[PDB]
Amino acid sequence: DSFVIRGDEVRQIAPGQTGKIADYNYKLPDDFTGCVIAWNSNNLDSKVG
Amino acid sequence: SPLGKLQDVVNQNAQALNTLVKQLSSNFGAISSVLNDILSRLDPPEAEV
């Protein structure tokens, strides 16, 4: 599963975490088994304006 | 007083049941004895713990 989120909301991509992203965008089950991988994408995903 | 042995048996059983019922007021290291309070005030993984 691949998506782009704010740096603050990286914590929300975890089992049993409550946030705007967790509630209304991407939800992880508490019993989820797997690995969450996040890396900064500022250089390519941010443009001026 | 002669029937004290039969009354000791009744008293011991009543005391054991009372102790068992009273144990439901014991936190056992949890935040609260009440299950509903734990569920309402905590996220599901923390509540499960």
Curated annotation (Swiss-Prot), chain B:
It comes from the Viruses. Residues 7-49 form a coiled coil. Changing S40A: In strain: Alpha/B.1.1.7. Subunit of the fusion protein that is processed upon entry into the host cell. Mediates fusion of the virion and cellular membranes by functioning as a class I viral fusion protein. Contains a viral fusion peptide that is unmasked after S2 cleavage. This cleavage can occur at the cell membrane by host TMPRSS2 or during endocytosis by host CSTL. In either case, this triggers an extensive and irreversible conformational change that leads to fusion of the viral envelope with the cellular cytoplasmic membrane, releasing viral genomic RNA into the host cell cytoplasm. This is Spike protein S2'. It comes from Severe acute respiratory syndrome coronavirus 2. The gene is S.
